Subunit: 264 residues, 4 copies
């Protein structure tokens, strides 16, 4: 019964609270370590607290692997994420895809995986992504076409902003966010190219509409997924859609119609 | 019957109108007192009008405490708020948590507590907060991780904007609001750190999405709570949800099905 | 039958098209008159076209007053608006509440009153205003409290932005719109008052939320009112709410329950 | 059976994938051609790859015209668009309505027409436009009235921003987007015209509300149209509205009421 006694401990509220308190503590020490003025002894102390925090996470994950099984633990995405986050910190010479995994503060993302209500918010957002993939692709297509056009049109006269494809993608993102789009970019561009507005004004109209569509699509779907997940976590099931309720109401009416026309 | 005669006065439309007119008058005199050019006599006069306004609020709250009872009055959050707002002004040497309670203009917040339709708007907003707590926590987590990262990454080269955790939290809030994010912050940062966009562009994408989710969540829930509260204030009850209407419609169909299969 | 023959002309599509074409023509000549470089003869010609346009509107409104009756015409807000717009132009020495009614281009607002689909959009927006009055009042209260606070706190050190109540209302509106709020206003203010963010960041959080609530409230209600008005204009009636459909469905079930329990 | 064998090839997933891969390849070579530093041989090579890509699109469209028929192919808007996009590239001396069709990168818009999920997003957006035409017209009317007013009011003192109708339309679009509206435009204008805020603040209030209404109207309708189109593409039909489900439920209740009152 040892593994079962350990699962009862792991799945308890107090154990979740201890682990949450250690993530907050680890997050607090990493925040204090951003302070350049600190003494060597103060830094050494905080680095030992970070070591103590990480060790508690190793015991916890090992306690989880034994109480669930290697395949049973890695079955959940949140468990694998927690494993990767902790295991990465135990690698001195590491390699990913950017530069170096020196951002230890990403360990505070564990607050999301450990707290179930927070876990459900991220879950809802992630599950809402496939449904907006075509809107996001449409926005990606518009950005690329615009970046190529802006490079060819304005790159030779405005090389800081449109000198290459990378530079144009960056200033088009800025233009889309409406940040200094006119006083900083388009009015100076119009001094050399007077009809530049025929490009930037339709670019703004299209991208702000498409990006708002993308964001609304995520928020609307994510809110409904999380709402359903909150219901299943509390009652064991979620509220059935209006269409299903009306379908079952229609079936009951077809059943009474049969028990009236011939056998009545 | 004295306390009952006083409640009939307190709960009347005319009494509410008199108190509203005194809050507007007190608000108007505090606004005139912002004028530095005013004579000593004009300031003295307006300060006596503020004293007269506050005295009317003391009589009103005392009239309320007697007509409801100490425990009956303090049972409502709006009554306690009105009590605190008025009582605070009668304290010369006060202490809270900031610097000093010299902002007497917060007395105009009583317009919200005294006007029931306005009271319902704030009520709807306040009751909508627990439901967005996890989205707000997710935004708080993202801000903290980002602030620590920005301090470590850019603090030594950009100390005005990222020199410490407090400075980084402030400029990340600015970046999230899209205010001069590129012309003022990220283009100057990219001159020293060319890949800074890999940090700021995903930061903007994530936070604008999460903050919009937080705001939409508040507005959608608050509007429904206020709508229900407006219905209960006018008719005594609110409109039942579609799910409940369909549930009772389903019960009526189960009742007629029973009165058809066997006893018919 | 003369008045009835005139109403058939007035209410026709062709007459509406002629009047629309004259508003567009009048709008086009007023736009050409903004050009400072024009000759005296060109200006004189366009001013005569504006005179011809206005005369057509006088004949039209007079044709409407006779075919409906003085009280019958003025019964509609759109007819009174059309009357005021045209009649105002026939007054040389006029007085309203601002400076002078020299903005003749407001005559292009008649495109809204003459085109029924456009008339319904404005109608929906106007009818949606009472329902957001308390949200708008809440925003007005927050602005006033903030303006008084900003005047007292920052007026002596920042008189251009906060020197008086009017100046503070203006820069708080700018701060609410997020326009240069940090690089232009709050960072310079924080150089003198380091804790200024404790005021401006909660001000931004509260006002952007309240203004979004105000706008969403208008758009959601206006869209539903216009939708109903579009239905009534095409079919003579609008779609009944789901609550009413379920109410009548419930009444039919109560009727069959009565015709089953006792008399069956 | 030749035309039928060709349609089976055209309508297959693999053929769609080959054409998609060629659009991506053509898009990639046009993006590489924005690079000014490239050698003459590298440019020549990429220009031949663009020629090869375009030739594959000619074979594909010709294969489509034969397998469907001239009138059958041109029956679809997407086929005509694909035809125009490819055929335009085979014209050396061309003329449209702007300057010159040198933006070959518009060929990447074929990703939208070739991918059905992407085709449905654009379809939903395009079909949602007639329904917002009156809101867009209302915004067009407000812009024109404002542009004429701004030209007459501020053109002589601010000719860069309001010197003519075109200049005023441009800076009003900027003001509507809230870009440097106060620090860049209205504060400098108020130094000469102190009551300029009476014009710009109501202009901002009205246009941001109307533009948000326009965008929300597009997103809400487009999302529902695309959702219905996604359902019809997968199952052959779409989900019926709640109103229709309740209508058929009401008809079933009227049918059982008839089979109870007289013949029971
Ligand atoms: C969905 C939209 C996604 C937009 C993504 C844009 C990223 C492109 C940014 C990039 O790759 N750069 C090159 C990195 O080497 C940045 C350039 O803009 C940079 O060269 C200039 O800004 C310099 O002037 C540095 O200040
Ligand atoms: C959810 C997001 C919440 C963001 C909240 C950010 C508040 C942090 C602001 C703060 O604590 N500061 C230190 C107060 O002492 C402000 C600093 O940014 C300030 O030191 C610099 O701006 C100076 O250069 C003054 O001009
Ligand atoms: C719901 C929010 C509503 C906000 C409305 C704000 C309007 C207040 C503007 C006003 O009354 N002013 C005084 C008009 O005399 C404008 C001042 O701001 C002005 O004195 C300064 O800006 C000068 O420096 C001129 O450049
Ligand atoms: C729904 C709203 C639609 C707004 C559309 C606005 C377009 C008008 C722009 C235009 O026609 N211009 C004239 C083109 O010749 C641009 C001017 O603004 C330009 O003359 C000045 O900006 C110069 O100073 C150049 O820097
Ligand atoms: Na903005
Ligand atoms: Na800005
Ligand atoms: Na700016």
């Amino acid at each position: 019964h040892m593994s079962r006694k350990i699962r009862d401990l792991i799945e308890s509220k107090r154990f979740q609270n201890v682990i949450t308190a250690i993530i907050v503590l680890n997050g607090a020490v990493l925040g204090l370590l951003t302070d350049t003025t600190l003494s060597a002894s103060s830094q050494n102390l905080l680095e030992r607290v970070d070591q103590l925090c990480l060790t508690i996470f190793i015991v916890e994950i090992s306690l989880k692997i034994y109480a669930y099984g290697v395949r049973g633990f890695f079955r959940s995405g949140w468990n694998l994420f927690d494993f990767v986050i902790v295991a990465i910190a135990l690698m001195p010479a590491q390699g990913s895809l950017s530069v170096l995994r020196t951002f230890r503060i990403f360990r505070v993302m564990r607050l999301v995986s450990v707290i179930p209500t927070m876990r459900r918010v991220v879950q809802g957002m992630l599950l809402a992504l496939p449904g907006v993939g075509s809107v996001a692709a449409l926005l990606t297509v518009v950005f690329y076409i615009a970046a190529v056009m802006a490079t060819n049109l304005y790159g030779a006269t405005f090389p800081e902003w449109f000198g290459d494809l990378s530079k144009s993608l960056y200033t088009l993102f800025q233009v889309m966010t409406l940040e200094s789009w006119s006083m900083g970019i388009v009015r100076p561009v119009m001094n050399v190219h007077p009809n530049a507005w025929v490009f930037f004004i339709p670019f703004i109209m299209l991208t702000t509409l498409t990006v708002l569509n993308l964001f609304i699509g995520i928020i609307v779907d994510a809110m409904a997924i999380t709402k359903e997940q909150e219901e299943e976590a509390k009652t064991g099931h979620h509220q059935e859609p209006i269409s299903q309720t009306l379908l079952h109401l229609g079936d009951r009416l077809d059943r009474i119609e049969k028990q009236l026309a011939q056998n009545n």
